[PDB]
Design a binder for this molecule. Structure first.
Ligand code: GTP
Ligand code: GTP
Ligand code: GDP
Ligand code: GDP
Ligand code: MG
Ligand code: MG
Lengths: 430, 432, 430, 432
């Protein structure tokens, strides 16, 4: 059976991971103690996708948690699902990174990387057919950026044929959380732009907007944003675990979504997202979900899609569905949004449907978009990296860890090429 | 996070320490006798005896028995390890040379021995906390010795220090301009980021924000203890956007020679006045950027902010923090240097400040501490340097330093180093 | 029936012996008072292998305990199983050895050796078909090294046709326990390198590592390390006592494990070894045990096997088993670890399976390895013997007991030949 | 293990003996009257009368009635055998010649007779324990006689002796340099390994480690008694890695003429100060290798360690010992001679130290005693020899020795023997 191993690094990495297995276990009806309590046999038919069965009426999720300080992982152990993971997979250091990409990649993480790969190798050996890898981290973060890229390069070298997904939180344009985000992002993009097959960019700014208006949540917290992120991440692999009329696995999405090897950055989405008051006054039907998922306000990325165009779109539906309705709405989006799709790609939509919906919903859909509008995101980082690096604003911390100033300029140029390549394909043949 | 080490040198540092550890004991529910009786991560600042007792991980040092004698006879006498309370025979007498060359050399070896033993029991050491007075005999001469010793012996570790920066108008000693510059020259290289606080600024806060008309050094230390507690809240509790000890220097030190951020805290309200204020996130967030609320008399509006760390604490919502920070960045009166588009380093912890019995600070479920490396401190340095050269032009008090084993050349070298520091702020304060 | 007599000399010898019969008696259900309380008839079918029955519903283990001082043997008498042994077999001196090989071999032990052989002869005469001997001691020790070698030479001269096993504790590379270990080991290897058919080298350093990480034991003691050692020692003779699909006795292992007469030094191993917390998250199956037993971290020897190659490997399994699974994993180890086996030996694995598992486990396996990596162990001793003997660091104690300095140099050369012979066969024909 | 014999000669040895047997009686629960009333291996040091009484296996000897008279009138009067308390008429008067030639010869025969009877009741004799002062009339002259007699009569047996090595700075007698060398020359060949302890070093420990400001010889002997108890713990209790009496000489005597190891003990803490320290295995293990904790004033850092015996005692874990020893060996400040790659001889016993009522030592469940044959003692020998030749150049006190039956030639021969011993340390202190 197609199988995956999940990797989570850094504070954002682990916390989203924790709010991810809290949801995968719910879909498969897995008790926090690890015992199965699902009400349907169709959940165990593909449990092995994320879990390695341990004899005794319990299942263990093959996940690897990496963090240079133990603070974030200690909280996970104390969580409702902390005891679910195998204790051996909890690998951590002692000196946490100071939000510097250098320390999490060259000096501190270099010593612990060997330990991480050994667990990863055992998990891979425990599988019968490994399909790909999943990494959760944050580009602005030091551990995730630095240690995540180091792990991606090693596993890619070790397993070149296998896929690898990345759900990376991207710095927001207006309000940040770390001063030196521009350095961490550019260094990390320099590695993800050649090592990973598909990446999903997420920003908390966009998620904050969703909670404020789309969901009318007065006091959201990361306990809530991670739930939205976990919904999309679970949706991407609905096909590997449950049956449907038109199944689309990780590789199928990659081929339909990645036209050129370097243009593998997507913006996820989800629907329906309605408050409790609005539940009465809305009909949960295919025609309404299609509008919500293509709405710029429902996007989990700060960049407005309307400022660009879509190379490829992939729609993953869930629940009881009508194929003709799904075909109709996608056709309407193709015709209605005439200038929102490139001319050199006559078909821009990849549709997928699954029979089982998520949680208590009777219908769900997940939106993946490889829109050209993401150029405005790297461009902003491109301006924030240049302004700081122009006079060595914070370089003396990265230099002291071994990084040479030459590596910095190469990543900036490799970042400018990515934006130029995005602008290049935004053109039209006529 | 793992262990962090504390060092208290001089009367100011020692007296601050007993206030800092009063909060630490209260926060973790540790009794004043060293036994827990009301958060298991208290091991960052405490070492368990193994028999139901906790020894604070601090090294109180002074060259006189008076200040440490009070601690030995105070309620926390049974708390500290007897050998940690290292004391000398004769005070440095406000002379930098004595605390660094003559009398400081005699007791420096014993201090390191205890420091070495504290490290031996560390499964992980983030850095050191050194409390001292920026101007003073023991707090300026002996601290420089430790900074040199700690840097060479350990190195590759954060070294945070809290300094009582001399107030421009108020001053309680005559030869402070000599003393402050001498330690600055010797501690600039071996330091990572030194938090600065004035006595005058805290007095003004105690008079305007608080309704206390009779403040004392005891009140100031209690209002400074929460500054240290907030900075180390991440290492001792759990919450979104944890800020490790080493993250402070990376975010707040753009250049190796500019690591002197100032401290601000909010809310600061009396028990009665609290009933009339909502104290929402925007209110406290805006308060942190008010000249009337900062703990350094230098005017923030007179310069530009380069980096800022916002260590939100309590029942705060991350969405509110992001919106509040956006409001600050769009203000036109506030100005950040162009070469740093991003300056805010947010930190959220789920542990509201503890209430110190008998204190002048009201109970608040939502508090924030701001660390801002601002160029406005350059004006303060110039004024301090202006005092130094005016005295040194006539050798006002040089003969005392000369006879204590310090050459006259150091005065010229130290001032020139200070002059370069002023130029460094000028260089980073402009953009094309 | 095939029968064995156990000999234990020195402090380490007797204590491991005591923690060995505490386990053999458990497998056969023998009460500490000597009466049989087993729940299965299959235990008494081969009890005579280690025990001489005494009429009256009691059994007596034919074991010979030798020690120059009575301190270690007096404690054994006071142990839970002290009264199990025949009082006559407790043979001891008065002047204990001062950790000098000379005193335990030439001066002090020479007087008591006659007494020891007489008991040994009676035990042999009490048997119907004696198969071999077992000796437990410590090379660094004086009594075991000195008295153990003296006994081995005498019994070998008396019983040349019979086999003799030796479970010798070898000095650790990093932290030692006796100053003069290099002298004792080299002198003792000089005797074991021609008198015994197979030897099992054990070091406490490696056992300490197992307890720290593999077993997560916070406060281990020799009461615990000896239990691990006794498990392997009992496993080697599972076939002589209980039935199985593929039985392998002591001689069968010797022929499959000893290619050349002098290369009879092995490194034992055991599996599964998991802590109480890890018991939930692991499946006790053949595929997992094979990885654990070939893991360098599960080895009871300090030398890393990966630094060398395996001439011969022997796997002794226990419990309900599947032959095809056992064959599969050994084949995988042969192919996966391509460079870990010599080319001049196409088959390197000798498999054995027994029906009954140990204690409460439903599956166990014992690992025996004749790896070439053990050359780094004698080489280290070779350097520590040379540095001391270079200027007669402690020779005046051995000289005073009669030993001539000439014997010292011959053993050093005989030790260098052993390392050269190990390096010689590490080569490849092409 | 079987019997070990004890001998106490001189005021220092006799006074140490009553302290040593105070511990032995307390450890085995034997009352001071010689009856057991609270470990059956106590026969190593005691002989059972057969009527519910135990006679300690010691031979107290002196040339004066004063010191032994105190024992006869002390609480342990009924303990010792009356004939064991052999006493002379006139003291040796601090003269080596008297204790070896004139007055020592008169009483030596009686001492051997008792020693012979003690051996007759031995099913196994590991060796002898001889307590004396390295410098003194009876403790230097009479001990040499016994060493010669015991070696020839018995031989082929361990002979351990504890000596009060003259302190470099502190000295309570004038002609000690003459006395110490004379016994060293005559006792070097017949000895196996002599443990050395200074009065100044123990005083410093009692002042720094312990909080006792009024120490006395009574305190020192009590702190020296546990040294002897730990060395013989294996012979009297059970535990992993038992260290027999004869194992000490094999491990700690690389060469026949270098058998003078020094003694260190840990933990040494007062009752109050113990509450503030965990006292883990690494802490005590590291303490044993501290200049501030060793019982000989010679600086360990001034030389190199050749062999070390670690007799861990109490509830210790063997894994912790191995890890702790590994930490010591990787230290760069500590240095072991190249020709001895392995120097540590570990010993673990499951019997924590007993608490002596009224003592200055706190109750600890985990104690360790270290014996280290270190080359740093060579400096002490040179200083002692420096005193001898300076006096002997003028015959400062030779006439007293000459008139007591000792030829002047022995002074030259003894010093030359000492000079060779200094060269022996130099030869073994370097490697290519
Ligand atoms: N906030 C605060 N400042 C203090 C306190 N005690 C002393 N100071 C400051 O310390 C400055 C003078 O240096 P001190 O710390 O008093 O002197 P010292 O550190 O003991 O060094 P010496 O010269 O050897 O006495 C004064 O100007 C005070 O402002 C205190 O308890 N709280
Ligand atoms: N540690 C310790 N040393 C002692 C004690 N009593 C005497 N000494 C040492 O003995 C040295 C002098 O030799 P003594 O033992 O006193 O004299 P002696 O053995 O009686 O021989 P005489 O010369 O005949 O008196 C002094 O330097 C003391 O250091 C004691 O109770 N404890
Ligand atoms: N969605 C989400 N994002 C988070 C969470 N915690 C932290 N982040 C993001 O992580 C970024 C900081 O990087 P971080 O991972 O904490 O640094 P690191 O520990 O060195 O990897 C911030 O920009 C946050 O937006 C969380 O719980 N949920
Ligand atoms: N594995 C193990 N080794 C031991 C044990 N007891 C002692 N040893 C080893 O035995 C060595 C000391 O030699 P020993 O046998 O005690 O001397 P002997 O009594 O004269 O034979 C030390 O190096 C220890 O490593 C034990 O219980 N288990
Ligand atoms: Mg002072
Ligand atoms: Mg006397």
């Amino acid at each position: 059976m197609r199988e995956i191993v999940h990797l989570q690094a850094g504070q954002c990495g682990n916390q989203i991971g924790a709010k991810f297995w809290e949801v995968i276990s719910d879909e498969h009806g897995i008790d926090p103690t690890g015992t199965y309590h699902g009400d349907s046999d169709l959940q165990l038919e593909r449990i092995n996708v994320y879990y390695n069965e341990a004899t005794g009426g319990k299942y263990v999720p093959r996940a690897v948690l990496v963090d240079l300080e133990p603070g974030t992982m200690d909280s996970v152990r104390s969580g409702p699902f902390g005891q679910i993971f195998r204790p051996d997979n909890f690998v951590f250091g002692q000196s946490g990174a100071g939000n510097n990409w250098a320390k999490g990649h060259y000096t501190e993480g270099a010593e612990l990387v060997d330990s991480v790969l050994d667990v990863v190798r055992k998990e891979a050996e425990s599988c019968d057919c490994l399909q790909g890898f999943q990494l959760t981290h944050s580009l602005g973060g030091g551990t995730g950026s630095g240690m995540g890229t180091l792990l991606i390069s090693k596993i890619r070298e070790e397993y070149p044929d296998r896929i690898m997904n990345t759900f990376s939180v991207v710095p927001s344009p207006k309000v940040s959380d770390t001063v030196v985000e521009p350095y961490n992002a550019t260094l990390s993009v320099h590695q993800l732009v050649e090592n990973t097959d598909e990446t999903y960019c997420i920003d908390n700014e966009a998620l904050y907007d969703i909670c404020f208006r789309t969901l009318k949540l007065t006091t959201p917290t990361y306990g809530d944003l991670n739930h939205l992120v976990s919904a999309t991440m679970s949706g991407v692999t609905t096909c590997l675990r449950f049956p449907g009329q038109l199944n689309a696995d990780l590789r199928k999405l990659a081929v339909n979504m990645v036209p050129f090897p370097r243009l593998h950055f997507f913006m996820p989405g989800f629907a329906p997202l309605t408050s409790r008051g609005s539940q009465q006054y809305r009909a949960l039907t295919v025609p309404e979900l299609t509008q919500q998922m293509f709405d710029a306000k429902n996007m989990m990325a700060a960049c407005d899609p309307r400022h660009g165009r879509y190379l490829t779109v992939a729609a993953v539906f869930r629940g009881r569905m009508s194929m003709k309705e799904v075909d109709e709405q996608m056709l309407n989006v193709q015709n209605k949004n005439s200038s929102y799709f490139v001319e050199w790609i006559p078909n821009n939509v990849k549709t997928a449907v699954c029979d089982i919906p998520p949680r208590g919903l009777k219908m769900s859909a997940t939106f993946i978009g490889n829109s050209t509008a993401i150029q405005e995101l790297f461009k902003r980082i491109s301006e924030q990296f240049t302004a700081m690096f122009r006079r060595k604003a914070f370089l003396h911390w990265y230099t002291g860890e071994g990084m040479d100033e030459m590596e910095f300029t190469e990543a900036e140029s490799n970042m400018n090429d990515l934006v130029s390549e995005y602008q290049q394909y935004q053109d039209a043949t006529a | 996070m793992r262990e962090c080490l504390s060092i208290h040198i001089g009367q100011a540092g020692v007296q601050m320490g007993n206030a800092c550890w009063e909060l630490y004991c209260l926060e973790h529910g540790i009794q004043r006798d060293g036994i827990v009786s009301d958060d298991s991560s208290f091991g960052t600042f405490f070492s368990e005896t193994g028999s139901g007792k906790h020894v604070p991980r601090a090294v109180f040092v002074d060259l006189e028995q008076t200040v440490i004698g009070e601690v030995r006879t105070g309620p926390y006498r049974s708390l500290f390890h007897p050998e940690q309370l290292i004391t000398g025979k004769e005070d440095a007498a406000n002379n930098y040379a004595r605390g660094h060359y003559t009398i400081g050399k005699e007791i420096v070896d014993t201090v390191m021995d205890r420091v070495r033993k504290m490290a031996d029991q560390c499964s992980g050491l983030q850095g050191f906390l050194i409390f001292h007075s920026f101007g003073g005999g023991t707090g300026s001469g002996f601290t420089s010795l430790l900074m040199e010793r700690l840097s060479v012996d350990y190195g590759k570790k954060s070294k945070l220090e809290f300094s009582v920066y001399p107030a421009p108008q108020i001053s309680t000693a005559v030869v402070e301009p000599y003393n402050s510059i001498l330690t600055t020259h010797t501690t600039l290289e071996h330091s990572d980021c030194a938090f600065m606080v004035d006595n005058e600024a805290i007095y003004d806060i105690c008079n305007r924000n608080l309704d206390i008309e009779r403040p004392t050094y005891t009140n100031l230390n209690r209002l400074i203890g929460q500054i240290v507690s907030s900075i180390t809240a991440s290492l001792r509790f759990d919450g979104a956007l944890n800020v490790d000890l080493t993250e402070f220097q990376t975010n707040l030190v753009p250049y190796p020679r500019i690591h002197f951020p100032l401290v601000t805290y909010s809310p600061i309200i009396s028990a009665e006045k609290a009933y009339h204020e909502q104290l929402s996130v925007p209110e406290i967030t805006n308060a942190c950027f008010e000249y009337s609320n900062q703990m350094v008399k230098c005017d923030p509006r007179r310069g530009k902010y380069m980096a800022c760390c916002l260590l939100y604490r309590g029942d705060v919502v991350p969405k509110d923090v992001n919106a509040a920070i956006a409001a600050i960045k769009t203000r036109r009166t506030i100005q950040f240097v162009d070469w740093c588009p991003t300056g805010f380093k947010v930190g959220i912890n789920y542990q509201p400040p503890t209430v110190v019995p008998g204190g002048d600070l009201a109970k608040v479920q939502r508090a924030v501490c701001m660390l801002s490396n601002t160029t406005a401190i350059a004006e303060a340095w110039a004024r301090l340097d202006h005092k130094f050269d005016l005295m040194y032009s006539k050798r006002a008090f040089v003969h005392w330093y000369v006879g204590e084993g310090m050459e006259e050349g150091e005065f010229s070298e130290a001032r020139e180093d200070m002059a370069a520091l002023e130029k460094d702020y000028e260089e980073v304060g402009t953009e094309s």
